[PDB]
Ligand code: CLA
Ligand code: CLA
Ligand SMILES: CCCCCCCCCCCCCCCC(=O)OC[C@H](CO[C@@H]1O[C@H](CS(=O)(=O)O)[C@@H](O)[C@H](O)[C@H]1O)OC(=O)CCCCCCCCCCCCCCC
C-alpha cells in the first residue's frame with residue numbers, strides 16, 4: 001500500500017522555458033525594483 | 039568533435055548528504071547571525 | 077532616502093523563482109540523461 | 113542598533129547553499145528515477 | 149493556581165502510574181529470547 | 184545464506200531498492216537485470232484493475 | 241500523503257478511486273449550515289459567546 | 297555517481313576544459329577586481345587626504 | 353562536613369553507576385544475551401524494517 | 404483475546420514504533436516535551452529575571468534585546484534559593500516569571516527526561532537482545548548536566564548558581580566557577596579535559612585508521628562509502644593493515660590487536676573522563692576546591708616569588724571582585 | 738487499499754458515485770429556488786444601492802445611533 | 803526585527819531535524 | 835547603494851539574453 | 867505537608883488514578899498463570 005502511487009508523473013522544463021522564466025523574473029525585478037525601493 | 043565528451047560523469051547527492059548539508063547551513067546561520075547583526 | 081528591507085524584497089523575489097526554474101531545468105536534464 | 117544589510121548576508125548565505133543542496137538532491141533523485 | 153496544581157498532580161500521577169504498573173507487567177519476559 | 188533468509192522473509196531487501204547503491208551503481212542495474220527482490224513486474228493498467236477488483240463491493 | 245490508498249476513497253461498484261461529489265456537497269453544506277446557525281445563534285447573540293463589535 | 301566534492305575532477309584528464317575552467321576563474325577574478333575598484337570609487341571621498349586617507 | 357559530603361556523594365553516584373551496570377547485566381544474563389547477539393537467530397533480522 | 408492492559412503494554416514496548424516509547428519513555432516524552440516547550444517560549448519571549456534577588460532583573464529572551472548567543476533562560480532568584488518554585492507557589496504568573504520559575508521547571512523536567520533517556524536506552528537494548536551498557540555511557544553527560552544544574556545549586560544553596568540555559572550564561576557560569584573554585588587546578592577537571600582531548604584524539608585516530616585501510620570495493624567515479632553495504636557479513640576494512648601501520652608508527656604493541664578491546668577503550672576513556680569532571684564539579688559544589696599553589700615559592704628572606712599559579716590567582720581575583728555586582732555586602736564570600 | 742474503522746464508518750457516505758436520477762429530476766424546483774435567490778439578491782443589492790428604499794431601513798452610517 | 807530572523811533560523815533547523823528523522827532514506831539490505 | 839542593485843539586475847537580464855542566444859537548445863528535425 | 871498536599875481535593879486524583887491503573891493491571895494479572903517458577907525470570911505471559 002505505502003509504495004507505488006500510480007499517479008506519479010515526471011516534470012519537465014526544457015531550455016526554452018528556462019530562458020523564458022529567467023527573462024520574465026529578471027525583467028520583473030528590473031521593473032519593480034524602482035517601486036519597491038521607493 | 040563538438041559532442042560527446044568522454045569525461046562526462048553524473049553527480050549524486052543522497053538524502054543523508056542533503057540532510058547533513060541542510061543541518062550544517064542552518065546551524066552555521068544560527069551561529070553567525072548574531073555576529074553579522076552586531 | 078531609499079527604504080531598507082526593499083533590498084531583501086528585490087533580491088529574494090529575484091532569486092527564489094530563478095532557483096525554482098534552475099532546479100526544474102537541471103532535474104529535467106538529468107532525467108533525460110538517465111533515460112539514455 | 114542592529115546593523116542593516118546583515119539581513120541580506122544572513123538570508124542569502126542561508127539560502128544559496130541550501131538552494132545548491134536541494135538542486136543536487138532533486139537532480140540525483142530524478143536521475144535515479146529515470147534509471148529505472 | 150489551584151486548578152493548574154491539580155491538573156499537574158493528575159498528569160504526574162497518571163504517567164507515574166503507567167510507568168509503575170507497566171514495569172510490574174512482567175517486563176523481563178518482553179525480550180526476544182522468550183519461549 | 185541463512186541470514187539473507189529470515190531477513191528477506193521479515194521484509195528487508197524490499198521497499199528501497201537504491202539505498203546503499205551509488206548513482207552509477209544503481210544505473211548499471213535496472214538496465215541489465217537484477218530486479219528488486221521480493222517484487223514482480225506488472226503493467227500500470229493491470230495493477231489498477233487488480234486494485235479495483237480488490238476493493239470491489 | 242503517506243496513507244493515500246484508503247478503502248473509503250474507492251468506489252464499491254467499480255473499484256476505481258472516486259468521490260461521490262453530490263453527497264460530499266450535501267455533507268459539507270449540512271456542516272456549514274450547522275456552523276453558521278451555531279455562530280449566529282450563540283456567538284453573535286451572546287447566548288454562548290462574546291458577541292460582535294458594535295459601535296455608534 | 298560523483299560526489300558533490302569531486303565534481304571538478306572531470307577536467308583532470310581533459311586539458312581543453314581545464315584551460316576553460318582556468319579561464320573562467322581568471323575572468324571571475326578580473327571581474328572582481330574591476331567591480332571592486334568601481335565600488336570603491338563610488339564610495340571614496342578624496343576631499344581630505346590628510347585626515348581622511350584611503351585606509352581610513 | 354565537606355569531606356563527608358563529597359566522599360559520600362562520589363560514592364552514591366559511583367554506586368548508581370554500579371546499579372545500572374549490574375541491573376543491565378542481570379537482565380541480559382537472565383534473558384540470555386549477555387555474551388552477545390546470536391548469529392543464527394538475530395532478533396533484529398526477524399523484525400520488519402522500521403521505515 | 405488478551406486484556407486491554409496487555410495490549411497497551413504490547414504497544415508501549417513495541418519494536419514496530421518508528422520511535423521506541425517504552426515505559427521509561429512514558430516518563431521521558433512528556434517531561435522532555437514540557438521542558439522543550441517552556442524553553443522555546445521562554446527563550447523567545449520571557450520578561451527579565453531578578454536572578455540575584457536584588458531587584459535588578461537580567462534580560463535573557465530574544466524579545467527583550469538578546470541574540471542567539473546572549474539569549475538564555477535565566478536561573479531563578481536568589482531569594483528563592485533551592486526552595487521548590489512551581490507556578491502554583493507564586494502569587495501570580497508574572498511573579499513566577501520575575502523570580503525565574505521557568506528555570507526550575509525546565510531543569511526538573513530535563514533531568515527527569517534524561518534519566519528517562521538512560522532508562523529508555525537500556526529498554527531498547529533489552530528489547531533488541533543486545534548488551535545494555537550504552538546507558539552507562541550516557542550517564543556521564545547526564546552526570547555533568549546534573550552537576551551543573553542541580554548539585555551545584557544544592558551545594559551552594561541557590562538555584563541562581565546553576566548554569567544558565569544559554570551560551571553567554573554558560574560562559575558566565577564557567578568564569579564565576581573558575582573565580583570561586585579554581586576548577587582549572589582541580590585534578591578531576593584536568594581528568595575531564597584529558598578525557599575530551601583523548602576522546603577527540605582516539606576518535607580521529609580510529610576514524611583515520613579505518614578510513615586508511617578500507618578494502619577496495621568501488622570504482623574511481625563513486626564515493627568509497629558505497630563499498631560497504633548495510634548488513635553485509637564481511638568486514639569492510641583491513642584491521643590487520645591498520646594494526647600494522649599503527650604498530651610501525653609508534654611501537655609494535657602500542658596498538659590494539661583486538662577490535663573489541665579497542666572499542667572498549669574508545670567507550671571507556673571519555674566516559675570515565677566526563678564522570679570524573681562531573682564528580683569534580685559535584686565536589687566543588689560543597690567547596691572542596693582544586694589545588695592551591697599560591698605563594699608557594701619564597702626567597703631566603705621570605706619574599707613571595709610569584710609562579711604561574713599566582714598569575715592564575717590574579718586572574719581569578721579579577722573575576723571574583725567583579726562577579727555578582729552589589730550582591731556582596733560582606734568581605735568574605737562564604 | 739487498507740481498511741480502517743473510520744473508513745468503514747464513512748464508507749456508505751461515499752458509495753454512490755455516478756448514481757443519477759433519470760430524466761430531468763428536480764430541475765424545475767431547482768430553477769424556482771434559483772429564481773427566488775435571484776430576486777432576493779436583487780432586493781438586497783438595490784437596498785444597498787439605495788435604489789430601493791424601505792420603511793425603517795436607513796442605509797446609512799448614522800443608523801447606528 | 804532580527805528576533806524574527808533568529809526565530810526563523812531556529813525553526814528551520816528544527817524542521818530540518820524533523821524531516822531528517824521522519825523522512826529519512828529507509829535503510830534496506832542489498833542483495834550483494 | 836540601490837544603483838548597484840539596478841546594475842546587477844540589468845546585467846543579469848543581459849546575461850540571460852546572452853545565454854538564451856548562444857547557449858540555446860539546438861533545433862533539429864525529428865525522425866517522426 | 868505530606869506529598870506537598872495542602873488542599874484535600876488534591877488527594878482525589880493522586881489516590882484515584884493509581885486505583886484505575888491497578889484495575890487494568892489486575893485484569894492483566896488475573897489473566898496470568900500465577901504459580902511459582904524456578905528460574906531467573908518468568909517466561910509465561
Ligand atoms: C466558524 C465560526 C466561529 C468562529 C470563527 C469563532 C471565533 C471565536 N470564538 Mg466562537 N463560537 C462559535 C463559532 C465561531 N467562533 C460557535 C458556533 C459557538 C457556540 C458553540 C461559539 C462559542 C464561543 C464561546 C463560548 C467563546 C468563543 C470565543 C471565540 C473567540 C476565540 C476562539 C478562537 O479563536 O478559537 C481559535 C481556535 C483554534 C484556532 C483551533 C485550534 C485548537 C487546537 C488545534 C487545539 C488542539 C486540541 C485538540 C483537542 C487536539 C488535541 C489532540 C491532538 C494533539 C492529537 C473567536 C473570536 C471565545 C471568546 O469570547 O473569545 C474572546 C469564547 O469564550 N466562541
Ligand atoms: C449554498 C447554496 C446552494 C448551493 C451551492 C447548491 C448547489 C447545488 N444545487 Mg441546490 N439548493 C439549495 C442550496 C444550494 N444548492 C437550496 C437552499 C435548495 C432548496 C431546498 C436547493 C435545491 C436544489 C434542487 C432541487 C436541486 C439543486 C441542485 C444543485 C446542484 C446543481 C445546481 C445547478 O444546476 O446549477 C445551475 C446553475 C449554474 C450551472 C450556473 C448559475 C450561474 C449564475 C446564474 C450566473 C449569474 C451571474 C450574474 C452576473 C448575476 C447577476 C444578478 C445579480 C446582480 C442579482 C448544485 C450541487 C440540483 C441537483 O443536482 O440536485 C442534487 C437540483 O436538482 N438544488
Ligand atoms: C554585481 C557584482 C557583485 C560582486 C562584485 C564585488 C564588488 C562589488 C561590491 C558589492 C557591494 C555589495 C555590498 C554593498 C555594501 C553594503 O552592504 O553596505 C552598505 C549599506 C549599509 O546600509 C546603509 O546604512 C546607512 C546608515 S548606517 O551605515 O547603517 O549607519 C543608511 O543609508 C541605510 O541604513 C543603508 O543604506 O548596505 C545596504 O543597505 C545596501 C544593501 C547591500 C546592496 C545589495 C547588493 C546587491 C548585489 C548582491 C548580488 C547577490 C549575489 C548573488 C550571486 C551572483
Ligand SMILES: CCCCCCCCCCCCCCCC(=O)OC[C@H](CO[C@@H]1O[C@H](CS(=O)(=O)O)[C@@H](O)[C@H](O)[C@H]1O)OC(=O)CCCCCCCCCCCCCCC
Nearest residue numbers: 594595597598601660661664665667668671672673675676
Ligand atoms: C594501584 C593499582 C590498584 C588500582 C588500579 C587498578 C588497575 C585498573 C585496571 C585493572 C582492572 C581492569 C583490567 C583491564 C580492563 C579490561 O576490561 O580488560 C580487557 C581488555 C584488556 O586487554 C585485553 O584482554 C583480553 C584478554 S581477557 O579476556 O581480558 O582475559 C584480550 O583478548 C585482548 O587482546 C586484550 O586487549 O580491555 C582493554 O583493552 C582496556 C585496557 C585499559 C583499561 C584499564 C587501564 C586504564 C585506562 C585509563 C582509564 C580511563 C581514564 C581516562 C581519564 C581521562
Ligand SMILES: CCCCCCCCCCCCCCCC(=O)OC[C@H](COP(=O)(O)OC[C@@H](O)CO)OC(=O)CCCCCCCCCCCCCCC
Nearest residue numbers: 050051052055058059061062065128129132299300626628
Ligand atoms: C557563489 C557560490 C556560493 C555557493 C558556495 C557554497 C555552497 C556549498 C555548500 C555545501 C557544503 C555542504 C557540506 C555538506 C554535505 C555533506 O555533509 O554530505 C555528506 C557527505 C556524504 O559523503 P559520501 O562521499 O557518502 O557522499 C555521498 C554523495 O552522494 C554525496 O555527494 O560527506 C561529505 O560530504 C563529507 C563532509 C562531511 C561534512 C559533515 C557536515 C556536518 C557538519 C556539522 C553539521 C552541524 C552540526 C550541528 C551541531 C553542532
Ligand SMILES: CC1=CCCC(C)(C)[C@H]1/C=C/C(C)=C/C=C/C(C)=C/C=C/C=C(C)/C=C/C=C(C)/C=C/C1=C(C)CCCC1(C)C
Nearest residue numbers: 121125321323324325326327328329330331332845848852
Ligand atoms: C562572502 C564570502 C564567502 C567566504 C569568503 C569571503 C569571506 C572572502 C567572501 C568572498 C566571496 C566571493 C568569492 C565573492 C566573489 C565575487 C566575484 C567573483 C565577483 C566578480 C564579478 C564579475 C563581473 C561583475 C564581470 C563583469 C564582466 C562583464 C559585464 C563583461 C561583459 C562583456 C563580455 C561578456 C563580452 C565582451 C564585451 C564585454 C562588455 C567586455
Ligand code: OEX
Nearest residue numbers: 559563564583727736737
Ligand atoms: O552566587 Mn554563585 O558562589 Ca554561593 O558562595 Mn556566595 O553565593 Mn555567590 O559567592 Mn560564593
Ligand SMILES: [Cl-]
Nearest residue numbers: 730731732733
Ligand atoms: Cl555578602
